[PDB]
Unconditional design. Sequence first.
Lengths: 148, 147, 310, 310, 310, 310
Amino acid sequence: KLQVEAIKRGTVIDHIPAQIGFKLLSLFKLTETDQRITIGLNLPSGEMGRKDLIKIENTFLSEDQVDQLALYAPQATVNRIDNYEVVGKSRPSLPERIDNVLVCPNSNCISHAEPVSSSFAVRKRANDIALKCKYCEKEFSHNVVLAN
Amino acid sequence: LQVEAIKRGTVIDHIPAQIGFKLLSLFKLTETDQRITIGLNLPSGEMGRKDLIKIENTFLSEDQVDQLALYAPQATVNRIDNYEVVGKSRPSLPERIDNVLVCPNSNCISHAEPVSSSFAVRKRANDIALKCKYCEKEFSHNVVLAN
Amino acid sequence: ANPLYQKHIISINDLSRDDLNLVLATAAKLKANPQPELLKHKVIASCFFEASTRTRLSFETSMHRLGASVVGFSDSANTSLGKKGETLADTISVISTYVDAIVMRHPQEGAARLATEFSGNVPVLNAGDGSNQHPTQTLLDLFTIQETQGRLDNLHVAMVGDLKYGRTVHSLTQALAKFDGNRFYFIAPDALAMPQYILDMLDEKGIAWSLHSSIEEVMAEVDILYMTRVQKERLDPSEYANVKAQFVLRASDLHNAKANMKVLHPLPRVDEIATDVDKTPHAWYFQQAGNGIFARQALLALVLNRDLVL
Amino acid sequence: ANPLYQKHIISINDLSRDDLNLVLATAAKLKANPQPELLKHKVIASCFFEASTRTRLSFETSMHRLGASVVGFSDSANTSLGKKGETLADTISVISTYVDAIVMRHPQEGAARLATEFSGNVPVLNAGDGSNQHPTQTLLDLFTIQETQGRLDNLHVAMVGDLKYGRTVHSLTQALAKFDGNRFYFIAPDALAMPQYILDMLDEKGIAWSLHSSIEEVMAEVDILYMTRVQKERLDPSEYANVKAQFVLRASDLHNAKANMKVLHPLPRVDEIATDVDKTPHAWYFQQAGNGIFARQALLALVLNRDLVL
Amino acid sequence: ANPLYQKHIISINDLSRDDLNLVLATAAKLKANPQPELLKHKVIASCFFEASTRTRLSFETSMHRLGASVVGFSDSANTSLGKKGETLADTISVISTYVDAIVMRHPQEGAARLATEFSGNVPVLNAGDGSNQHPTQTLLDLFTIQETQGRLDNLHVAMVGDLKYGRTVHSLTQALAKFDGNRFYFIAPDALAMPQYILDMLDEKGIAWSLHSSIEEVMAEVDILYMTRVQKERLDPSEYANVKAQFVLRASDLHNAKANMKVLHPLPRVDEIATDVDKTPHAWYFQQAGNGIFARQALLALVLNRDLVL
Amino acid sequence: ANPLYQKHIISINDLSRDDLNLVLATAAKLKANPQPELLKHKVIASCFFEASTRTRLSFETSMHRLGASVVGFSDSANTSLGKKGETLADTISVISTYVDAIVMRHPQEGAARLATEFSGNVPVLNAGDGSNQHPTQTLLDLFTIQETQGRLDNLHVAMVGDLKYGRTVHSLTQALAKFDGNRFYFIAPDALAMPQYILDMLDEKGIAWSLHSSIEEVMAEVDILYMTRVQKERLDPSEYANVKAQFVLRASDLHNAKANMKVLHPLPRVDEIATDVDKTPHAWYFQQAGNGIFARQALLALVLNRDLVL
Ligand SMILES: Nc1ccn([C@@H]2O[C@H](COP(=O)(O)OP(=O)(O)OP(=O)(O)O)[C@@H](O)[C@H]2O)c(=O)n1
Ligand SMILES: Nc1ccn([C@@H]2O[C@H](COP(=O)(O)OP(=O)(O)OP(=O)(O)O)[C@@H](O)[C@H]2O)c(=O)n1
Ligand SMILES: O=c1ccn([C@@H]2O[C@H](COP(=O)(O)OP(=O)(O)OP(=O)(O)O)[C@@H](O)[C@H]2O)c(=O)[nH]1
Ligand SMILES: O=c1ccn([C@@H]2O[C@H](COP(=O)(O)OP(=O)(O)OP(=O)(O)O)[C@@H](O)[C@H]2O)c(=O)[nH]1
Ligand SMILES: [Mg+2]
Ligand SMILES: [Mg+2]
Ligand SMILES: [Zn+2]
Ligand SMILES: [Zn+2]
């Protein structure tokens, strides 16, 4: 059945949008470990047609670590696994703040080329999500922040 | 098998630990619709541990294999079709490396400009030396890699 | 300790109605009863990474009126370190080992906030960070409204000029919207309209605001007429001359003004207020400037002193 | 009177081991027990003919911490008199009728020495004269070593970076060579090697020094790792990138460092020390900068006050 | 003689449709068969009171391609000396005794028109006067559209970017409005909309135009996509970043573009056209710049040579 | 066509010995019999992004001596405006639609090479790219040696001065190393020695070279004494003064010089050649500069004219 076999224990992030799995591995430094990791990209899915999938053994994510996925993989399923059984399923929910991973689109923001981590207050609108920079205090569409 | 066999495509085996993700990034291997399966930190009989990249319905040209040499010089590029390994190659040092490197010379024209980086390669005194196409300066590969 | 002791003063967004009232009460008190030795033996850094003579003179005077010593710089580019390679982070890490408080003005948004992350236990006061915040200007503006009007609630406030790029009008509107029953009149060319994000903020709090083509539309009702600079250098010279007429104030415009009405302007004024206004009892822009001393003293005292003796 | 009362402070070459110890003892004392009125009624000239914001802020803060008043200038070229025709001799002849001490930084070697010849009974303190001396930087460096190490003798001191053009490393080496049993490790590209005249000085005193290609060669033994700036603008951009790797410090380099080891840097640091070093207990460059206040206060107190009350 | 012989070329509003067609016909002919000695023994002044390397190089190359000699200057060199003591009138009164034609660019609107009043018999060609006119840019734009589309009537023209402050798009719109059946699509942020005096002009002539917030709205219908540069000045950094995605073109935006559609841009295109567009068959901004040579040759030939070039 | 027809001239390392001999042969011919109309109707761009009066005057004179027209600019004029918004790629993409060849000088290494990638059919001649290449200087140097010595093989060549940072001596050494039997003598202070990558190159080819601390060591054996300027920047004032006497030539140093020996210097020679050398038969630096005209004419003729000049 399975190209990427079941694991005894750790975390499986399922239901990741195509072209987003690699993004997650990169942005969240997921491969910076010695633990065994198995990945499937462009896998078929019933519920989404085509998906990415990341398994990380002997590793678990907190609730906000899962929530930090919300912006890139809102319908992801994070499965906790021990002794071969899914002992927990959770789903990302918009966090109150997003640190480190975003870049402020204000070219005059002090955040650029200074030894600080980016930080954004999160608030859902209606047809997007607004991101307000901790430093320059400007608020942007998530669609603007996420792009170039 | 944690990452099962494929019918047709390329399997890059024997990648050093912590080099598999770097290869995915540098060479944009995941910018495709084809099914990719990956193992990182897998046990290896000959290496202790390794990384592993499988790209279905996809084959690498000879110079594409050779671009791996600076990162995974002992890698094994296997071509697969109908579940059979039809070819094995090991990267050889290329004579030029384009696109992925960054010239360490801060005054090089390459930085502010719509051109691809390019370095001529010379394994010489058993060091690998990289000469920038633009500024014509030559650097140790260790200096070019850090930047 | 008082609620502002050892706090950073970075943004009007971080200050509550209670905070603003405390600063203003303290400013009235120091105005009435100066304490020239309050900050004796304190050394304060006056760091103008972006030069601003008037704000700097004002801030340094406030330091001296409380007895503190002052070290600092003002930077065109002419300054050693100075416009080049060292990070602001490192500059603050160093200076915060020297002094008891840092007052700083900088051309980049967020610069004062970044400074707080490296100043350890040394308080940072933002004297202006790019197009973001200038909280002491807002505090002096608020102090002036409160002193002349007797309150910060249920006011009719007109704002006139460049409402789009005026950081001081955005901050003042945000601050007044922390109080109840205020009503706003915005008078600006369409190219320089008060931004939608401010309007949405007002709408959410059920605060009334409306647009008007001229000052005479609302002169009868206004308590505070807050005039802003309109920098020609971001309008077409022809465009500016085409639109200036409705954002320029002369003494004759004040004929039906209420007895309590005050005209404010953060300065410099160039074209926007004719000099014949100066002698009217409504002119209050130089008094406003004067009040910067008391608002800035109050902030320094509260931040650097646990319990205000009075 | 103390041995430094009314003395000029021009060169580390003029200061004895006893002199250095006195300054350092006095700095520890003022650090522990400040004397904010010690120099009350003294006026000190802060004369930066060559601009240096960090040194000037440091020096002026020290003046204010002792209660002195400060007059001065900082000169790009923008300053009346100011870059042109009047001799430095005349400038000093005038200023020394105004003030009680002159702190001066100048782009020409020997400028502070020349000043002493025209300042009459007014003490001159050299805050940097071209590529020659910067004695207060050395004193703050020494104070920092002494405070963290408990001594100035029998130390293992590594110096890393531009050892050829660093006036601060030459002076520090000269000063430490006034003490006994110190051993030096010099880590620099061949183009920026510690000069032969310094090496000959060490050889004559039987002080051990050796060259090393990397910091890891000596990390296990080092007490003080003194990192210097390497100004790109005197290496080829290609040359710099070719050689920077062995003169750049990261937290990972500190794995086998002794518990007492401190990393120093006169600042600004740009490339030479990664920010991950900052949080290690070995990072001491901002503390070092902080110590400039106490070393500079000690110097001013000793020079301007006969008998240190303590 | 030909209709433009010895005429001044100051404003697109002084050139009739027949004049425009004549310049373009002459440009096509000189492109097909050069006349390298047509203006032999002519001396032309290239007077760039306001510097513009690209416009100046283009104009001077055109002079040389016709065999004329060139004298001139580029300015903004009274950087801190100040503005002229001597009037532009006097400068032109003198230069017009030297040369056979004057090509001039100047920071003030109307400068070329004033020049014609002092140049006597000598023709003045306007290479740009402030935010007023830039007729040869419009001529090269028109020539480029005519060449790639085969006509200047019944076209669907999109203009994108700073439509408010672009003298080049105002002129091109006025020029295309001299022809019949053209349809306009204006894509601009609200702050940078095509001015009303332009829309009124189109309305008087019964010419259809519409506003759009995005290029994709119109891509499938456009024959010409005329991009302009959004000046960072004209905006706040944060504002610019919020709007940018609208006025920026990348190759993927062209998927539904008509095969004949050409993308133009008067240059520099720094941000608004991604380099991936360059290799598409639609990219025509460098060819456009190239056509500046033939448009400017044509104008020089017609103004200075009595008989039509054939 | 001739081997250099329509070729880019970017680097000495791309020119073979045959190419070098061809340029020099062509230079000799044009010196003997000028061809003032060879490039009639050609337009050449003289693009000095980095200013260089002497190189630019030389190159433009060469263009005119062949009858070509010239358009261009000299820069470092974005003095405080800032670096380009527009890419060098775009500048070249535009200019290459104007002219028949581009001669360019630029402060960044690789700039001329990048230009070739955007210039299409238009040849690019490198007049200097940072510390990388300056091929026409090497060509004029070679032509001068060939003319005065009668050959480019079996020569004894001394190079003196800043051998470390002189792009001109690196190139001349690489060029002479394409010929046979040449012997090198490198006279330089330790801080400014000929780089190892050069010595390795000579070692691969079995070419003899030796280091000397003084010109007299080698004077009696040299055919060419190639002097370079020691940049005061590259050193400290005191260091420079300690070393100067080694790399400075005066007439008395030439007493034992061979009758055929010529002294060259790419200029300016400010310090290193005393004016008393000028009237000796060995002084050949002005004749050398003169030969720049013929070397640059030769290159322009070969690149732009299909057939060999005969
Ligand atoms: N020992 C295990 C158990 C399960 N999984 C993986 O974890 C994911 C969730 O397991 P499961 O709930 O059993 O699959 P589904 O029923 O499809 O769950 P969902 O509805 O979330 O898709 C699956 O991708 C499965 O392959 C695993 O890798 N190792
Ligand atoms: N249909 C197949 C066949 C092979 N492989 C993979 O390709 C690699 C090499 O194949 P193979 O020659 O069968 O394995 P080895 O004998 O171990 O070869 P080597 O000595 O190179 O390790 C292995 O990772 C194997 O799992 C695969 O993914 N799909
Ligand atoms: O752990 C896994 C899960 C899935 N897969 C591979 O992914 C594909 C789907 O296998 P699934 O098991 O995920 O089917 P599914 O219906 O549960 O999918 P969802 O709707 O929940 O998204 C199959 O091709 C399978 O081989 C793995 O290789 N490993
Ligand atoms: O295609 C593969 C190959 C290997 N693996 C997994 O990697 C581990 C090694 O399996 P291998 O099959 O690669 O063993 P090996 O002896 O050939 O190792 P090398 O020296 O050739 O490197 C095993 O745990 C296996 O499950 C896969 O999951 N998929
Ligand atoms: Mg499922
Ligand atoms: Mg194997
Ligand atoms: Zn920001
Ligand atoms: Zn390079």
